């Protein structure tokens, strides 16, 4: 099942790029949203605890919609991309409105969705505002900024994934996996995004390159995140299928990322 | 009651600027969202058909939240403003999430909100994408672009306003008022926004200044929009309180806007 994954990634990549295009997406944007592999695939992982296949394929795409929406919300603020700003915005909002719509139907408690989304919208947002204001300058201090725009971000789709997955789901363990997994990813993004498009202010790669964070710490943490992640997957019932993934990813930062630095 | 209005504008201006600030709003943004008079006031009009005072004050603020959210969504795409992009985005999303949350509680049919929002999200969005792509060059052709980002935009809060206002509301007449009123506003924005911050491509002011639209047509339409608006206010029960407003505004474009051109 390092198949089931790319099949859902293909299925979610299709649903999204079809909403993107039919809304006025340009050939550079449908193309952009189609190439957001990780985002499109992540939903599959968040719904691993979900039993019925259809409802699984269901919530997997719903999440993929809002996740990309959110993504484009970024690209519009970061402003790098080079795509048109007008589209990025509409399409963003479009996709969202939609995810809300579908997620809202796959819910047991309709009111449930808007709950999760609101619960800490202040943390998620004030956290990414301040994150980019007072750029971090040390681990205990980067792992704090990464705990918001990263951990809490995915934490929520984790919760949604659970509120729309169908009763008998380790509600909070799903979230634990989400929040844990998410950070290993952020480190994966920082350790890579320094080399590729030369970055440096607040970056987790720079802070290592200037004795502001010991490589041994980075690792310690990366190893804790696996621990924390693998822990939540076990929680009963348990998501055997994710055990391989958690390793596959954490092992990838360790193997091909941390070495460059 | 050209009082009840500024009192609700003051009440909605407060609710919003308090969410904006507590989320990380900068002193230039809380200041910006506080000065968005029209947006903050419009909700009051959309809930004129609503009987109970509390639920009215209720849905009036809820709408004010998403309306500003949407506004800032713009400012981020237009990109003019000069505020930080990171905030505009977060705060935007914040405010939204919130409006959804409150509106969602003042609903009879929870699922109802996400319905309205989705119903034509493709029209609202594809409409504002294409609107700015193939910039308009004549009335029958500007009044078409204005029929989306403008009419349908407010049409929806109109519908929400009705789905959260409380049974026994001219569901569709509220929307008629919204969509009608909205366009008179857009003309008010174009007829003014040409002089102020020198604009010209697709602008309803330019197209008059180059024989692409006869002033007599502009007026004909402005007069139809009042007709259409005043019509929906009458629809039973009827919103006597809005009759003065509809005039007050349409009469203002006629009196102090159309003359400059
Ligand atoms: C609060 C909001 C609107 C957040 C933006 C959405 C988000 C968390 C994107 C993840 O990007 P990333 O952190 O994985 O990397 P990159 O900066 O390259 O997109
Ligand atoms: C579809 C989206 C996200 C639309 C933006 C929100 C909106 C309709 C703002 C109204 O602005 P306006 O038309 O009254 O004038 P201005 O361009 O000056 O803000």
UniProtKB/TrEMBL annotation, chains A, B:
- Supply the InterPro entries for this chain: Isoprenoid_synthase_dom_sf
Q: Which gene encodes it?
A: moeN5
Q: Which superkingdom heads the taxonomic lineage of this protein's source?
A: Bacteria
State the protein's name.
Answer: MoeN5
- What is the source species? Streptomyces viridosporus
């Amino acid at each position: 099942y390092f198949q089931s994954m790319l099949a859902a990634e293909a299925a979610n990549r299709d649903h999204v790029t079809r909403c993107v295009a039919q809304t006025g997406g340009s050939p550079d944007l449908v193309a952009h949203t189609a190439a957001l592999r990780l985002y499109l695939r992540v939903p599959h992982f968040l719904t691993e605890w979900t039993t019925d296949p259809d409802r699984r394929a269901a919530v997997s795409r719903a999440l993929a919609l809002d996740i990309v929406s959110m993504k484009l919300l970024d690209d519009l603020m970061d402003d790098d991309t080079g795509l048109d700003r007008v589209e990025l915005a509409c399409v963003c909002l479009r996709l969202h409105l939609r995810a809300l719509h579908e997620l809202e139907s796959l819910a047991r408690d309709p009111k449930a969705v808007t709950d999760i989304l609101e619960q800490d919208a202040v943390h998620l947002c004030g956290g990414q505002i301040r994150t980019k204001r007072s750029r971090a300058t040390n681990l205990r201090e980067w792992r704090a900024h990464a705990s918001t725009y990263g951990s809490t971000f995915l934490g929520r789709y984790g919760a949604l994934a659970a509120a729309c997955g169908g009763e008998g789901q380790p509600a909070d363990s799903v979230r634990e996996f989400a929040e844990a997994f998410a950070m290993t990813i952020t480190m994966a993004d920082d350790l890579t995004d320094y080399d590729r498009n030369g970055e440096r202010d607040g970056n987790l790669a720079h802070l290592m390159r200037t004795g502001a964070v010991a490589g041994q710490d980075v690792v310690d943490l990366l190893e804790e995140l696996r621990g924390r992640a693998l822990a939540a997957v076990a929680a009963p019932p348990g998501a055997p299928g994710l055990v391989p993934v958690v390793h596959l990813y954490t092992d990838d930062v360790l193997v091909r990322l941390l070495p460059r630095h």
